Amino acid sequence: GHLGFLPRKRAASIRARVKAFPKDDRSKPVALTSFLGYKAGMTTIVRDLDRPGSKFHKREVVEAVTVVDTPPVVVVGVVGYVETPRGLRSLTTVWAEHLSDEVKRRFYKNWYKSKKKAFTKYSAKYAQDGAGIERELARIKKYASVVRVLVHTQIRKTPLAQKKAHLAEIQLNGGSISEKVDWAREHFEKTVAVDSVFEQNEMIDAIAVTKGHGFEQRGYHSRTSINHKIYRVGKGDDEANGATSFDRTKKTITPMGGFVHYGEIKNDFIMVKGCIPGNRKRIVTLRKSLYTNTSRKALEEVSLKWIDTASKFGKGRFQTPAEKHAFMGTLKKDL
């Protein structure tokens, strides 16, 4: 067993809030420290191994990498945290005066019966001659010692049927807390690209709730996995995302017939080797190593050779419908 993981009780919520954030270099440029996403099945990857010393140097190796759907994240507010003897305290919060229907639904448990008066009063007062928002911004700039940004996922841009977004706070690691809120102000109602927070070969640590198992209570507990390298970052509009520099085949990373228990990838996604806690359709948050863990394995780049995108349901001998048609040829139902 492992007494450190006890109690093995149910998680507080599906969204496992991040307990700790990486170091805060107050001189670096403002940037986000975490990103949201949804697990989308898994796939096999074969690539060369540029790793001196290892016997498999200059050799191809088969590996399994998970695929997480990461639609562009949109910022809706910021949180200012002051330092107190009883720990960090949130003194105030602000909003963008405009909230997508997803977050508005997130604030209601019975949406269709609700009057949808989520933020009408606050928005009306926001449209005054200031003095209500600038006051809070100045208060945060003065007293707050650390600033966190509130964002939500674009569920309506996801093939899932949840139709509800999840609020999450992300710490800002870069410039002084005044520069932090100044940068946040320019990003209210804006969207942050997935490739801006992470890049290829970068190591990340995932945090999510694992698959539940019911009475044995087992599963459905929060877990953290560290030292996961990013193999490739793609975009929904970037056709042939599964086309490596070698494969160069105009095929998307989405498996033939769609993912198992999941839809199709038509948005930005992050590819990282190994598995991640949780299952498909589970919301996952991504952190970056919590520290300078830049080992040789992290430092070395991973030049992808081929990406598996065959039919994950059952088995598969072809990666695209064109290959199946060419190999099988014409059929009775074709003509």
């Binding site: 074969v46 190796v61 088969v62």
Partner: protein
């Protein structure tokens, strides 16, 4: 001695008490596994060998000279499916092994039958006496 690298955790399917054909012209017919050197002692686990592993075995069949004696043996065939680094899973025709001194020098002048790539790359002397590598 004999080894040329660090062990790779391939699938294990040859626990203690197993019998495998002696794939060499040393005259031995089969080798009986009594222990697996270098293995970990788990609770109630039977030490399990694999391709490229050095284990101690006794010649249960063959000429009387080799009978009743114990000498180190190197596994050349496992017959159990295992994951090679080159994607596809493979398994050999049947279990087989060779007898050699702890220094890796084979007792037989030449090995017969297919030889696992992992064992050949880990035991240079075995590859020297091998004629069919995979």
């Amino acid at each position: 001695n004999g080894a040329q690298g660090t062990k790779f955790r391939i699938s294990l399917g040859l626990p203690v008490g197993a019998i495998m054909n002696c794939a060499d012209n040393s005259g031995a017919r089969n080798l009986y596994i009594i222990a697996v050197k270098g293995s970990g002692s788990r609770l109630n686990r039977l030490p399990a060998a694999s391709l490229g592993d050095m284990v101690m075995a006794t010649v249960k069949k063959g000429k009387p000279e080799l009978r009743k004696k114990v000498m180190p043996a190197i596994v050349v065939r496992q017959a159990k499916s295992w994951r090679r680094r080159d994607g596809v899973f493979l398994y050999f025709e049947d279990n087989a092994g060779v007898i050699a001194n702890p220094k890796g020098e084979m007792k037989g002048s030449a090995i017969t039958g297919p030889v696992g790539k992992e064992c050949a790359d880990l035991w240079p002397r075995v590859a020297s006496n091998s004629g069919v590598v995979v």
